[PDB]
Amino acid sequence: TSRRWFHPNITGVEAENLLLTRGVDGSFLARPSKSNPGDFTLSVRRNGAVTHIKIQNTGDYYDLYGGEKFATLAELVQYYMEHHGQLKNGDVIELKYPLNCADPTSERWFHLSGKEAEKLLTEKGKHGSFLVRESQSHPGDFVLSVRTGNDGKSKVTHVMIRCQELKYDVGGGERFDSLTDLVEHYKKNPMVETLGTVLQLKQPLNTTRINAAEIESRVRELSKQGFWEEFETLQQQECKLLYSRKEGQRQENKNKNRYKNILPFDHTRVVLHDGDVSDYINANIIMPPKKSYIATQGCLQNTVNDFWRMVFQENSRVIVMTTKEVERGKSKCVKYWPDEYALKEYGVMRVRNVKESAAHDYTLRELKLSKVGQGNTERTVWQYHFRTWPDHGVPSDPGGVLDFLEEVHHKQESIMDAGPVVVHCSAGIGRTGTFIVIDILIDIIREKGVDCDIDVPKTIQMVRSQRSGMVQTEAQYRFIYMAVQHYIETL
């Protein structure tokens, strides 16, 4: 559970000099690419020299050049640190020693006046809530503000953090190389005041949960950048989500994955029962009377039957497809539905395409799904095929997506005992996560109006604990905020 090898603020020259003077052969770090915004670079030292490996993410997955595709940067680094000779003139590159970052930019607790910090800890703070800010009078020094406990039963204690020769301390004891190490140490060994108060560092002060009516003000603030700082602070927390994906790695299931290293978590994966290893599909239940979701990949030819097994077993009545079958010359999803008015058998599952209806942004396909030999198992599945997501980036306007989800939501609500909504793109983490997150947030607003708290990164982190890398890019992160803002404006 450490993402210290990611340096959000260094340059290529800085990374090279840092690896050459503070690292050894096998040392590595990751950083945002300065030449290609939105991409990343893995800088690795070997034989006294540094190599820079490009990592692209257009919105679907992290694509390591000359390597594999991954759901998060943490899952990428974990894979190559644990598989000795995979990273590559075909020359083996070893990730051995993470070169740790000292920049606190991406920490949830790092931020700020002493009055304002007291205000924030006053209003949305709890016992043990804390933050670290730059000192008011002493430049280069810092302050740790902790809430312990409006009647005097709670207080805010400020603790001065002195920076002396690039090491930090709270006036005595140990001297730390970084604010992170200092906070980590006093998290485990909390300071005790003379009269007995224990300055427990329980959780960072939440600053991202806001009232729905404040979203426009917050978006204006993040656009002044605040968006990039908030997103990367979210990305750092991905190291808490390296849950097991063993079932997807079994030999019998390797070919059931569109991308061999983008796999469902074992504890939330959809388990296929009553099979002819026949229980696997690259798909996860997503739980936020709210609806739930199945986030899954675009079908392969050899997983179409499993897809319909899943849809039938989970009683799903709505499918959301957020990709064309072919985009930019590449196949993203095999056609798993019949032509209009046609009927097909996919293993033991029978599907009739009853009728298609074309809107501008999407096609709706009314499908009748049943198990062969059992006419009483028939149920209608409504497939919503979104077709206007741009080849590059995210939509410039969220209106098409919002109108699409509103229709999808009302179809689902009209169906008694409908199961989870199936959502899929290519790998099923980027666009799929974006649609699901928007739908989760919009449903809160739809039922409570402006009188509700929403917390975009918390919602994403919760969804990311159920499928790897849900919401892939900062552009998608911005698009979720813009979609929520637009939805609130048109209430």
Does position 33 interact with ligand WAB (CB under 6 A)? The reply is no
The annotation status of 428 as a binding-site residue, yes or no, is yes
> Binding residue for ligand WAB (CB under 6 A) from 43, 129, 200, 233?
233
The contacts of residue 21 (CB under 8 Å, 6+ apart) are: none
> Binding residue for ligand WAB (CB under 6 A) from 93, 457, 464, 480?
457
Does position 202 interact with ligand WAB (CB under 6 A)? The reply is no
Q: Which of these ranges, 66-74, 200-208, 268-276, 407-415, lies near ligand WAB under the rule CB under 6 A?
A: 200-208
Order of all β-strands in the sheet with 97-98: 69-70, 62-64, 49-56, 40-46, 27-32, 97-98
CB of 114 to ligand WAB, least distance (A): 17
Beta bridge partners of 230: none
Q: Which is nearer to ligand WAB, 233 or 282 (CB)?
A: 233
Number of residues in contact with ligand WAB under rule CB under 6 A: 18
CB of 105 to ligand WAB, least distance (A): 5
Q: Which is nearer to ligand WAB, 229 or 453 (CB)?
A: 229
Q: Which is nearer to ligand WAB, 109 or 337 (CB)?
A: 109
CB 296 within 8 A of CB 290: no
Q: Which of these ranges, 15-23, 49-57, 146-154, 199-207, lies near ligand WAB under the rule CB under 6 A?
A: 199-207
The annotation status of 429 as a binding-site residue, yes or no, is yes
Q: Which of residues 205-224 bind ligand WAB (CB under 6 A)?
A: 206-208
Q: Which of these ranges, 29-37, 227-235, 266-274, 391-399, lies near ligand WAB under the rule CB under 6 A?
A: 227-235
- Dihedral angle at the C-alpha atoms of 300, 438, 399, 294, nearest 10 degrees? 30
Q: Which of these ranges, 62-70, 105-113, 178-186, 315-323, lies near ligand WAB under the rule CB under 6 A?
A: 105-113
Using DSSP bridges, classify how beta strands 318-321 and 374-386 pair: parallel, antiparallel or unpaired.
parallel
The annotation status of 399 as a binding-site residue, yes or no, is no
Q: Which of residues 461-480 bind ligand WAB (CB under 6 A)?
A: 461
Q: Which is nearer to ligand WAB, 79 or 227 (CB)?
A: 227
142 residue type, one letter:
F
The annotation status of 426 as a binding-site residue, yes or no, is yes
CB of 109 to ligand WAB, least distance (A): 7
CB of 469 to ligand WAB, least distance (A): 15
Q: Which of these ranges, 43-51, 100-108, 176-184, 392-400, lies near ligand WAB under the rule CB under 6 A?
A: 100-108
> Binding residue for ligand WAB (CB under 6 A) from 6, 61, 80, 110?
110
Residues 484, 406: Cα–Cα separation, whole Å: 13
CB of 442 to ligand WAB, least distance (A): 19
The annotation status of 472 as a binding-site residue, yes or no, is yes
Query: Can you read off the two tokens belonging to residue 262?
Result: 């983008």
For 351, half-sphere exposure in the C-beta direction (CA atoms, 13 angstrom radius) is 27
Q: Which residue in the list 101, 299, 333, 425 is annotated as catalytic?
A: 425
Q: Which of residues 375-414 bind ligand WAB (CB under 6 A)?
A: none
Q: Which of these ranges, 8-16, 95-103, 232-240, 349-357, lies near ligand WAB under the rule CB under 6 A?
A: 232-240
Does position 105 interact with ligand WAB (CB under 6 A)? The reply is yes
Beta bridge partners of 40: 32, 55
CB of 457 to ligand WAB, least distance (A): 3
Does position 237 interact with ligand WAB (CB under 6 A)? The reply is yes
> Binding residue for ligand WAB (CB under 6 A) from 60, 68, 94, 230?
230
Q: Which is nearer to ligand WAB, 75 or 107 (CB)?
A: 107
Catalytic site residue 101?
Answer: no
Does position 455 interact with ligand WAB (CB under 6 A)? The reply is yes
Q: Which is nearer to ligand WAB, 221 or 252 (CB)?
A: 221
CB of 205 to ligand WAB, least distance (A): 8
Query: Where is the binding site, in residues?
Result: 391, 425-431, 472
Tell me the catalytic residues. 425
Query: Where is the binding site for substrate, in residues?
Result: 391, 425-431, 472
Applying CB under 6 A, which residues contact ligand WAB? 105, 107-108, 110-111, 204, 206-208, 229-230, 233-234, 237, 455, 457-458, 461
